[PDB]
Design a protein around this nucleic acid. Structure first.
Ligand SMILES: [Mg+2]
Ligand SMILES: [Mg+2]
Ligand SMILES: [Mg+2]
Ligand SMILES: [Mg+2]
Ligand SMILES: [Zn+2]
Ligand SMILES: [Zn+2]
Ligand SMILES: [Zn+2]
Length: 87
RNA sequence: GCCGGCCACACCUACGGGGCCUGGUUAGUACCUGGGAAACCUGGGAAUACCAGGUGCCGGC
C-alpha cells in the first residue's frame, strides 16, 4: 500500500501513481511534468501526459515510400495529405 | 463554410467497422535504479492482451 503524509492525510492508495496524482489537492503544482527540452508544461494525470508527448513525437507520412514527409501537428499532417496525395 | 487555437474523440471506411482517445485488468508485474550475505526494502516502471463506453470543442470574417 501507498500512503501520503502531506499533513497526516492518511489516505491509502494501491498504486503510487494514484498517490502522486492525489497531491494536486494538497499544494497545487500539477504533478506530471514534461521531459522534452524547454517545455514548461505540466498535467493532472499520467495518461493525459502520455498523450501530450505525441506532440514532440512526429506525425510521419506513411502514404507511400517516395514520400518521407513528417508534419509537426496532426492538422499539418492532414493538410499534407490534403494536397500531395489526391485521388 | 473559410481561417486560426488545440494537435486524430478531429482521420479512413468494401459502410460491417478500422484507427484514435478514455476508464478497469494484465501490473505495482516482466524489468531497469540503487541498498543489501539474503528474505526482502527503496525509487521508477512497460510490453502484450482483455473488458467497458466515446468519437471533434473554442475564437474570427
Ligand atoms: Mg522541460
Ligand atoms: Mg479546422
Ligand atoms: Mg518497487
Ligand atoms: Mg465557430
Ligand atoms: Zn495526501
Ligand atoms: Zn511537452
Ligand atoms: Zn506524403
Amino acid at each position: 500500500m501507498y500512503v501520503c503524509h502531506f499533513e497526516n492525510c492518511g489516505k491509502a492508495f494501491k498504486k503510487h501513481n494514484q498517490l502522486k496524482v492525489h497531491q494536486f489537492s494538497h499544494t497545487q503544482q500539477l504533478p506530471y511534468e514534461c521531459p522534452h527540452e524547454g517545455c514548461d508544461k505540466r498535467f493532472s494525470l499520467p495518461s493525459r501526459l502520455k498523450r501530450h508527448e505525441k506532440v514532440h513525437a512526429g506525425y510521419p507520412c506513411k502514404k507511400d515510400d517516395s514520400c518521407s514527409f513528417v508534419g509537426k501537428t496532426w492538422t499539418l499532417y492532414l493538410k499534407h495529405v490534403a494536397e500531395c496525395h489526391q485521388d
